[PDB]
Chains A and B, each alone.
Chain A
Amino acid sequence: DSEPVLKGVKLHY
C-alpha cells in the first residue's frame, strides 16, 4: 500500500 512512515516531528508552538 506504500503508506509513508513518520520518523520525525517538530512542533513550533
Chain B
Amino acid sequence: PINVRVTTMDAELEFAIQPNTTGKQLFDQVVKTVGLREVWFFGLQYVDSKGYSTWLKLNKKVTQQDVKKENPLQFKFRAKFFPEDVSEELIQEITQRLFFLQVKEAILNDEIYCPPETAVLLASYAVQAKYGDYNKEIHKPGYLANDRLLPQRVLEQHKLTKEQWEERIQNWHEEHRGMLREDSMMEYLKIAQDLEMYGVNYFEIKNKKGTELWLGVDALGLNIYEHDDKLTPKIGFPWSEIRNISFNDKKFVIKPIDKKAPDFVFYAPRLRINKRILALCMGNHELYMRRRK
C-alpha cells in the first residue's frame, strides 16, 4: 500500500495509490474533490531525497519522482503559477480563497518581505474576511489576542507592544465595515501581489567565479539577485528580452536579445535543479503568452 496525503490550504485528503498511479490521476482527484476548475495555476508540491521543495510532474508516476519516503507521503496542493493580476485572472471563489490563504501564510511566515504598514493593512483585511464587520458588542477589547496577524520580522522592530499592535489593526478593521468576505480576501491579494518577493521562485546558484547568487523565476521572466539582496534584482531578463535559455548538466546560460550583450552564465548544484528551473520557465512563459493572444 502507498499512503499519500494531499493538503490544500484548508483541506486534507488521504489517498491509497498504486505504483502505476500518475501525478495527473492524483491531481485530478484532488481537483474534482474540492471542485476547482482553474487548474492551470496549481500543482502538487513535495520534498525529495535531498530535501528540495519541487513540484510533481503530472505526466509521470508518483513513485518515479524521488518523493521523500514517509508513511503518509506528503503533497501540498498549492498555487504553482501566479497571475499578473489577481483581479483579472482568479475567477472562482475556491481559487481566490486558496490563493489568499497561501499568500497570507507566506507573508506571516516571513517568506515574502513586507513593510510594517502594509503588514497591518494586510492583517486588517484578513480579520474583515474572518470576522466580518467589527461590532462594538461581540468584538470587545482583546478579540484578536489569539489571532496570528503579523509576521515576526515586523514584530522584531518592537516599537509597539503586542496590545498596541492589535489596537491599530482593530482601527483598520473598522474602516472595512461595508466589505464582504470575498472582496476582503481579494483586497488582501491586490496588495500582496505588488510586494517585490511575491510570486518569485528562488534558486540558489553561483556564477563562473564561484560567487553565490539567487535566480528568480516569476510570471514575467528571470532575475539575478546578489546573495544578500533577495528584494531587488541586479539583472532582469523579461521574456521579450531573452534570445534563448539553455542548460547542460549544471551549467545554465541566458542569452539576451541585445546581441552585443554577453550571455549570463550560472551554475546549479546539480542537473535536477536546472531541470526544475527550466520547467518553471516553460510554465510561466506559456501562461505569459496565453495572456496576450
Contacts and interface: CB of A to CB of B under 8 A. Distances in A.
Interface of A: 2-13
B19 to A, nearest CB: 8
Contact of A8 (B14, B20, B22): B14
B21 interface: yes
Interface of B: 4, 10-18, 20-22, 25-26, 29, 33
Contacts of A3: 21, 25, 29
A13 B25 contact: no
B6 to A, nearest CB: 9
A1 to B, nearest CB: 8
A10 B189 CA distance: 25
Nearest to A5: B16
Contacts of B26: 4
Given A11-B11, A12-B10, A13-B10, A6 B17 contact: no
B10 A4 contact: no
A4 B20 contact: no
B20 A12 contact: no
A2 B16 contact: no
A4 B21 contact: yes
Contacts, number: 44
Nearest to B12: A10
Contacts of A5: 15-17
A6 B20 contact: no
A8 B25 contact: no
Contacts of B20: 2
A12 to B, nearest CB: 4
B11 A7 contact: no
Nearest to B3: A7
A5 to B, nearest CB: 5
B30 to A, nearest CB: 9
A2 B17 contact: yes
Contact of A2 (B13, B14, B21): B21
Contacts of A4: 4, 15-17, 21, 25-26, 29
A9 B18 CA distance: 19
Contacts of B22: 2
Given A2-B17, A2-B18, A4-B29, A9 B12 contact: yes
B121 to A, nearest CB: 25
A3 B62 CA distance: 12
B29 A9 contact: no
A10 to B, nearest CB: 4
A7 B25 contact: no
Nearest to B5: A8
